[PDB]
Amino acid sequence: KSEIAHRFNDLGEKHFKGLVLVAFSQYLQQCPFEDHVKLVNEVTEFAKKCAADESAENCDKSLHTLFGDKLCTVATLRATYGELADCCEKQEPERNECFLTHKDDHPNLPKLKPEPDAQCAAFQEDPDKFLGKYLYEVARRHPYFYGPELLFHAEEYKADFTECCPADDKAGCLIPKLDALKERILLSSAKERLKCSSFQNFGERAVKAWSVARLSQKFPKADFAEVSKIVTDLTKVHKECCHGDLLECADDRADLAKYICEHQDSISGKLKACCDKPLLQKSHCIAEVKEDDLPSDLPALAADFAEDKEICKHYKDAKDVFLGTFLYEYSRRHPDYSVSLLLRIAKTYEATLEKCCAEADPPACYATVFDQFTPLVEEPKSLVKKNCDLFEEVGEYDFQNALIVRYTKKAPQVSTPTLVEIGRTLGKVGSRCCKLPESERLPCSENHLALALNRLCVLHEKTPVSEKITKCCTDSLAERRPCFSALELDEGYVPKEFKAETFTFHADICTLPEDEKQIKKQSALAELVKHKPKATKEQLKTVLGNFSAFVAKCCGAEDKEACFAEEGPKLVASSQLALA
Ligand SMILES: O=C(O)Cc1ccccc1Nc1c(Cl)cccc1Cl
Ligand SMILES: COc1ccc2cc([C@H](C)C(=O)O)ccc2c1
């Protein structure tokens, strides 16, 4: 009857306001903060009004109608948001869909540097404004961030400024925390963007399948029934959030978290610490909970899925339940597999039964079906061992460079910053995963990879440069990682013409902190590969190392610029002979 009243009542004012700010910040990334505060308070006041009389004029309008009307009042409409002023001409649900379509994955706003004195001051002087501003900035930059979860991260950014601001050295307490949080923010944005990307490109079925797999791994004690129910609910939550209905999403998420904690005895024995928490902390804990111990009573799958004579019938009767079942069972006995691998396996099963069940004698045909799985498992296992050996041996930086090269050879049309960012992200998978026990590295690796390759793909949607990437991004959610692995030097490349200034470093680099130095040299590394695509990886390691030494020494010098000026051109000219 009054959606706005109903969400204001279930969520409470704090989480209601927060979520409406987040939603606004994502729909209008370019709109200044103060403009959004007033719109939030404005809509929020209306909610209150409606909550006390749901018959009041306009209280029965859809959320969209109310929210889109609010956004379409924001000043400097056409100048600041060109393409979004056209959306305000529309009725809902066209209008909502045009907003949604014009969200910007790489708005490329200033990097968020902590100002610890000036922010503690703003924290103590007005914490609501201060926390609000954090939601705004993160939302702004990650327009598909998982709404309820951002409020959770806003609670940790509060806990942080709370403990460090009263302290002696605010900047020493606060900076490593705010760095850890940014890392968690980025990972979380990447997981949610993979969810939204899967809806957009593959549909709701592909999200269900993914979620059956992962929840079955996580909750192996649970019966198919119960995973199905959680998955149906979880898929609706994320569909909503992804489509921007953040208030609905949060409300539904809290009901799901209630449910799971109502039923943990029949879901998992790890939900116990999670269930003794406030709403946001609990939902978060459930969402990241460790995998439960395997049960002693796991069935043998062979009889039911490869030996049974009734398999084609069972399968023509309800494919999706038969397949969902195989996926649930295979998944829960395999936490040591990646989600994507589990889904390639299911897709091979399904394929084997469609081929075999139309054949002359199907059971002889599907008898060996589990053996089709074996090379699918060997492949990413080998990859992971091979990349972790490399990592263990050369370290993060060089492993990142190995990858910058590998990827620049595959898609040398990608801008340098993208290639650098993706090789760096990929190399950090190295860091996180290679150190885990031997049976956790394949899932760690391939699950985090999926996150990074989706980032790449999302960027490429905005700024398309390469048919090879378009193909790999669209052909199969489960096949992405193998599709990217199989890519080799684009022979279609005409080498990029040499511009000396691109390889030419100056004293400006010596100021930069360590990460920012690497980004520069890694940027030159990408550029080296674009001019000389056939250069071997060892030739580029030596040329890069000679650029490192060169930079280390000239930065170490009494006259930095005369050092760069004298020695730089020699190194630019000679290092082109050392490549191809
Ligand atoms: O690139 C690889 O796959 C591994 C490899 C093997 C031998 C020598 C160098 C590299 N990788 C690599 C590259 Cl391509 C550039 C800079 C530094 C390093 Cl360690
Ligand atoms: C364990 O650590 C890694 C890190 C990066 C990787 C990148 C790739 C890409 C997809 C590639 O094209 O080979 C594969 C495996 C990887 C394992």
Side-chain angles (χ1 to χ4, degrees):
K1 186 206 229 166
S2 183
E3 265 290 293
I4 205 176
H6 175 223
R7 308 305 164 192
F8 183 93
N9 292 333
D10 296 338
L11 299 175
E13 179 190 13
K14 192 183 155 151
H15 303 161
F16 179 101
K17 284 184 87 160
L19 288 158
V20 175
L21 178 49
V22 166
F24 286 23
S25 306
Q26 300 173 319
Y27 275 124
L28 284 188
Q29 308 171 250
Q30 267 274 84
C31 177
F33 174 58
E34 314 95 283
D35 281 57
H36 286 124
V37 158
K38 283 206 172 173
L39 300 184
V40 160
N41 293 335
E42 274 196 352
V43 145
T44 300
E45 278 179 48
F46 191 68
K48 278 172 207 193
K49 233 153 166 91
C50 297
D53 182 3
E54 292 168 276
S55 86
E57 207 67 275
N58 302 293
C59 291
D60 52 352
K61 288 182 160 194
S62 66
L63 287 190
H64 292 161
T65 274
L66 287 161
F67 291 5
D69 280 1
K70 191 53 49 173
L71 299 174
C72 293
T73 71
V74 169
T76 66
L77 203 37
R78 174 78 88 187
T80 296
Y81 337 73
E83 310 106 11
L84 322 188
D86 262 33
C87 306
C88 296
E89 313 288 65
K90 293 156 196 231
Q91 319 266 86
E92 301 283 8
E94 292 148 304
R95 183 174 69 175
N96 178 61
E97 186 68 12
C98 179
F99 277 101
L100 256 181
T101 315
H102 301 297
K103 280 182 159 156
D104 192 0
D105 287 297
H106 183 47
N108 206 106
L109 293 153
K111 309 93 165 54
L112 290 182
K113 329 229 151 185
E115 281 170 63
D117 290 310
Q119 286 177 301
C120 278
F123 178 57
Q124 291 143 356
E125 125 97 350
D126 190 346
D128 299 341
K129 178 192 218 127
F130 185 71
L131 296 170
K133 195 147 176 200
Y134 180 74
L135 291 174
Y136 168 68
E137 300 293 340
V138 179
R140 192 147 164 247
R141 288 166 173 77
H142 306 288
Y144 302 91
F145 203 94
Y146 193 20
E149 266 288 305
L150 187 46
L151 309 195
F152 171 76
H153 291 302
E155 273 171 346
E156 313 193 280
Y157 179 84
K158 179 185 146 153
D160 287 348
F161 282 87
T162 279
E163 197 216 294
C164 307
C165 296
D168 52 30
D169 178 10
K170 315 195 303 196
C173 178
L174 187 67
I175 299 295
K177 285 169 154 49
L178 292 183
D179 298 344
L181 180 75
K182 162 155 230 144
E183 197 178 353
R184 289 194 314 267
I185 282 291
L186 286 162
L187 179 69
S188 166
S189 165
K191 308 211 289 166
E192 196 61 12
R193 197 71 188 78
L194 179 54
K195 312 264 161 44
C196 305
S197 275
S198 295
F199 283 118
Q200 285 159 10
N201 295 304
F202 300 111
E204 199 185 310
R205 196 151 169 290
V207 172
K208 267 157 187 191
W210 193 95
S211 197
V212 164
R214 178 75 189 112
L215 311 185
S216 299
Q217 301 184 289
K218 267 196 198 210
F219 298 153
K221 159 218 261 99
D223 58 22
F224 184 56
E226 180 69 273
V227 166
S228 286
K229 140 74 178 176
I230 291 167
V231 170
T232 286
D233 292 358
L234 197 54
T235 304
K236 201 215 218 222
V237 164
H238 288 287
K239 195 209 213 165
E240 280 160 355
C241 258
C242 289
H243 196 61
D245 306 317
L246 264 59
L247 294 179
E248 226 194 311
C249 174
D251 218 353
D252 292 345
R253 183 179 192 249
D255 299 343
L256 172 59
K258 189 172 85 87
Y259 176 82
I260 292 173
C261 296
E262 258 174 301
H263 284 94
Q264 48 155 331
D265 274 19
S266 78
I267 291 162
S268 161
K270 313 309 222 208
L271 292 156
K272 188 185 173 177
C274 301
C275 293
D276 284 279
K277 288 187 165 75
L279 284 61
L280 292 174
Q281 350 286 268
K282 169 183 82 215
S283 301
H284 175 83
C285 187
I286 290 151
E288 298 295 319
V289 65
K290 317 316 175 72
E291 293 157 347
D292 202 347
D293 298 323
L294 289 189
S296 33
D297 76 352
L298 281 199
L301 300 199
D304 300 0
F305 289 106
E307 312 187 17
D308 206 288
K309 304 306 192 156
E310 214 65 319
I311 248 154
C312 298
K313 329 321 163 155
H314 287 191
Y315 170 71
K316 214 215 68 222
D317 271 19
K319 320 225 153 189
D320 301 304
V321 155
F322 194 71
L323 294 177
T325 316
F326 162 88
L327 178 55
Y328 152 88
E329 292 288 350
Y330 213 75
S331 290
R332 69 167 175 156
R333 67 179 300 160
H334 286 305
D336 69 328
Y337 289 8
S338 55
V339 174
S340 60
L341 170 59
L342 284 170
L343 292 168
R344 290 197 286 285
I345 287 176
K347 231 222 290 234
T348 294
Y349 194 68
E350 167 169 23
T352 288
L353 307 179
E354 293 275 312
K355 169 219 196 296
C356 292
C357 292
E359 225 173 58
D361 163 11
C365 183
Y366 64 77
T368 44
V369 64
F370 274 60
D371 306 296
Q372 296 342 284
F373 304 166
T374 288
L376 302 185
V377 165
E378 266 150 21
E379 199 245 317
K381 281 194 124 141
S382 251
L383 257 94
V384 167
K385 190 197 160 177
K386 170 185 133 137
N387 293 299
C388 290
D389 288 346
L390 185 66
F391 173 82
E392 227 91 74
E393 181 197 337
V394 311
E396 188 174 283
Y397 166 69
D398 275 305
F399 181 54
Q400 289 165 342
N401 297 338
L403 289 174
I404 287 166
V405 171
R406 200 185 294 174
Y407 273 82
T408 306
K409 294 176 180 280
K410 285 173 200 274
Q413 310 79 8
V414 169
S415 59
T416 286
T418 289
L419 291 164
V420 164
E421 158 165 325
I422 288 302
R424 292 177 67 76
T425 293
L426 289 176
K428 283 179 156 74
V429 168
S431 304
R432 168 192 269 286
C433 305
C434 295
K435 75 198 165 126
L436 306 181
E438 298 284 353
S439 84
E440 283 154 60
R441 313 207 310 201
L442 167 64
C444 194
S445 299
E446 205 175 15
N447 290 359
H448 280 85
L449 269 245
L451 304 177
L453 298 173
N454 191 59
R455 178 42 166 184
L456 175 60
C457 291
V458 165
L459 289 179
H460 205 259
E461 291 182 31
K462 182 192 173 57
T463 307
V465 293
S466 165
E467 281 156 327
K468 289 165 99 212
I469 287 154
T470 292
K471 247 180 76 111
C472 284
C473 291
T474 62
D475 273 23
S476 197
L477 184 60
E479 300 298 333
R480 288 205 172 154
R481 204 282 310 152
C483 188
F484 276 101
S485 287
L487 295 188
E488 316 167 40
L489 179 40
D490 197 329
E491 303 246 83
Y493 214 53
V494 176
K496 198 203 186 163
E497 197 53 90
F498 185 73
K499 183 151 73 212
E501 200 61 81
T502 287
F503 301 104
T504 298
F505 292 106
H506 292 269
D508 57 311
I509 198 172
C510 307
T511 76
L512 306 182
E514 181 53 20
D515 49 326
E516 308 189 15
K517 294 213 200 84
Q518 289 170 5
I519 287 162
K520 292 303 199 195
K521 297 188 276 167
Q522 291 171 324
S523 297
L525 192 59
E527 294 291 332
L528 287 178
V529 176
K530 295 182 205 198
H531 178 42
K532 293 301 187 76
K534 303 223 142 164
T536 69
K537 61 217 179 174
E538 168 56 46
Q539 283 163 308
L540 296 152
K541 181 179 173 101
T542 297
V543 170
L544 192 72
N546 297 339
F547 281 108
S548 264
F550 163 62
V551 170
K553 201 189 58 153
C554 286
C555 285
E558 179 259 284
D559 192 4
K560 295 163 184 11
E561 196 58 15
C563 197
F564 282 108
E566 175 57 25
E567 314 213 343
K570 323 214 159 198
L571 192 68
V572 175
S574 69
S575 73
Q576 294 311 318
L577 308 169
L579 313 168

